[PDB]
Amino acid sequence: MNTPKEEFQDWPIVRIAAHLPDLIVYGHFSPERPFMDYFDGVLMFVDISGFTAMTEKFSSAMYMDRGAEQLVEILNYHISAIVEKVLIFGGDILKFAGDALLALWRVERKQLKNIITVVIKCSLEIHGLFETLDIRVKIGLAAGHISMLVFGDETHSHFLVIGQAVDDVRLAQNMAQMNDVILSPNCWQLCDRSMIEIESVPDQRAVKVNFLKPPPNFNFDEFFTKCTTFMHYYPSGEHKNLLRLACTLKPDPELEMSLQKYVMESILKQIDNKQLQGYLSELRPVTIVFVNLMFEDQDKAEEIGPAIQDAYMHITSVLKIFQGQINKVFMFDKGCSFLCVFGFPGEKVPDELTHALECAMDIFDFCSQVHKIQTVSIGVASGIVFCGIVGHTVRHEYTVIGQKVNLAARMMMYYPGIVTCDSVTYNGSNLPAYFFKELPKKVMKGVADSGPLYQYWGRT
Ligand SMILES: Nc1ncnc2c1ncn2[C@@H]1O[C@H](COP(=O)(O)CP(=O)(O)OP(=O)(O)O)[C@@H](O)[C@H]1O
Ligand SMILES: Nc1nc(Cl)cc(N(Cc2cccs2)C2CC2)n1
Numbered sequence: 001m002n003t004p005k006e007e008f009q010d011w012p013i014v015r016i017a018a019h020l021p022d023l024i025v026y027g028h029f030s031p032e033r034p035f036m037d038y039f040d041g042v043l044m045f046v047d048i049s050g051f052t053a054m055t056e057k058f059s060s061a062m063y064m065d066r067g068a069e070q071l072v073e074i075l076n077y078h079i080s081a082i083v084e085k086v087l088i089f090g091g092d093i094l095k096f097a098g099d100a101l102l103a104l105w106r107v108e109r110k111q112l113k114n115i116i117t118v119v120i121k122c123s124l125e126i127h128g129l130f131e132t133l134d135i136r137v138k139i140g141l142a143a144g145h146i147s148m149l150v151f152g153d154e155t156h157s158h159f160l161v162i163g164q165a166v167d168d169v170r171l172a173q174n175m176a177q178m179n180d181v182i183l184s185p186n187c188w189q190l191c192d193r194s195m196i197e198i199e200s201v202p203d204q205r206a207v208k209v210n211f212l213k214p215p216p217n218f219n220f221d222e223f224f225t226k227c228t229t230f231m232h233y234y235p236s237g238e239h240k241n242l243l244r245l246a247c248t249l250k251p252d253p254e255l256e257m258s259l260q261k262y263v264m265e266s267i268l269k270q271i272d273n274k275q276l277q278g279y280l281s282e283l284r285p286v287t288i289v290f291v292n293l294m295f296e297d298q299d300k301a302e303e304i305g306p307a308i309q310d311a312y313m314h315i316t317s318v319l320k321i322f323q324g325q326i327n328k329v330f331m332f333d334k335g336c337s338f339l340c341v342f343g344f345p346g347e348k349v350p351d352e353l354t355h356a357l358e359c360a361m362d363i364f365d366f367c368s369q370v371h372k373i374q375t376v377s378i379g380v381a382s383g384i385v386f387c388g389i390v391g392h393t394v395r396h397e398y399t400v401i402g403q404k405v406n407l408a409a410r411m412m413m414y415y416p417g418i419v420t421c422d423s424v425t426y427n428g429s430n431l432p433a434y435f436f437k438e439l440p441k442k443v444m445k446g447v448a449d450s451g452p453l454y455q456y457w458g459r460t
């Protein structure tokens with residue numbers, strides 16, 4: 001009696017799970033919103049520098065109308081290797097944003113020291129990989145208490161990690177010069193100092209890792225194996241050949257119903273083999289509306305959660321009306337940011353610019369009265385941006401990369417408390433000139449040639 005091979009592996013639920021971390025896939029939590037949970041772990045924020053420039057070049061005529069296809073190929077060639085390293089070291093990729101990704105090793109408080117060692121080794125191996133396009137990799141690490149927030153409505157869900165360690169990992173990474181790994185202060189405080197050769201960062205309690213220098217008896221693989229005891233989802237045994245346990249998920253309509261809420265409809269359409277895979281990789285004219293919600297420095301996560309929930313409910317209704325989408329949500333330095341996009345798969349209109357501006361003002365007016373939100377700032381920029389699925393086969397997300405994305409994000413930070421827009425949006429809108437005010441030109445870090453910027457004043 002024959003015993004033929006292959007556990008079938010490519011169910012819709014498995015494909016959906018590629019778009020989510022284990023934190024969500026295996027989360028089994030309440031469907032109330034907001035939902036908050038608390039844990040400890042180590043974070044790694046890996047930020048590639050140089051794909052936004054590569055993006056601009058790939059629109060040129062030399063790429064012969066295949067710039068999006070070539071961009072996404074070369075990006076994924078590099079990012080998929082990084083993702084594999086993270087997964088093999090036992091980490092959970094939480095979210096992608098353009099050419100960056102945030103990863104988490106959730107562990108019990110007693111294991112933080114040991115896990116920091118595993119994550120530093122992983123970081124050094126990620127720097128390893130890149131002795132090969134013009135691109136640097138900056139890595140920040142942090143460790144400590146982390147809170148998870150899940151917010152949404154009955155058909156959509158969104159998550160974030162929050163707290164000092166999240167702020168710290170971002171601050172750490174941002175200090176790295178090309179190809180450095182930086183530890184947060186608390187990470188350096190908790191780590192195994194005998195193993196880890198560091199140096200001062202000027203005007204900073206963070207430190208740069210110079211070397212991993214283990215003792216005589218230390219064998220990394222035996223050490224790593226012991227650390228796997230504390231990793232709940234590390235593929236093992238008959239599944240040690242897999243990069244994720246999520247590859248073994250079996251059909252379960254209730255779990256699927258829950259996971260699909262995190263993923264865009266156009267992505268679900270591709271997952272369901274109702275649209276061609278290549279259709280979502282594009283260099284497409286869009287309008288980016290980047291909305292920043294600032295909370296007071298005193299604010300704790302249990303106050304932040306209901307306020308993001310409230311803002312979200314309004315953002316989503318306004319976007320539905322004006323034909324916009326939330327591409328990604330971020331939070332650090334007391335600012336929760338919604339990266340919103342007008343134009344992309346299906347939603348292409350003619351009055352898109354007018355609509356992005358009115359939508360932005362509606363969001364600004366509503367969110368300004370949400371209890372606990374100190375300041376709303378919204379940057380609006382229009383241009384050619386790369387849209388597509390970034391990452392590895394087993395762990396990837398839809399995202400956007402482009403100069404106008406970065407510009408919108410810089411506007412919102414440099415021109416706080418107002419709605420700002422770029423020249424393309426200004427000249428291209430229906431609207432008369434006195435709806436606007438021309439702004440003083442600020443020198444913006446990582447932005448040159450930016451052109452005239454405007455405040456969207458409104459009808460009044
Ligand atoms: N998705 C993201 N989430 C959080 N912070 C980000 C981010 N992208 C960039 N940043 C932060 O802002 C800092 C400056 O980023 P920038 O210099 O403006 C673009 P980059 O990340 O260097 O290269 P790039 O745009 O080719 O990819 C970063 O070092 C990082 O701390
Ligand atoms: N707060 C938060 N949560 C998640 Cl899950 C991701 C995220 N971001 C922004 C941050 C990067 C570094 C610390 S927070 C990642 C996807 C870019 N921010």
Ligand SMILES: [Ca+2]
Binds near residue numbers: 099100
């Ligand atoms: Ca980047």
Ligand SMILES: [Cl-]
Binds near residue numbers: 393
């Ligand atoms: Cl891949």
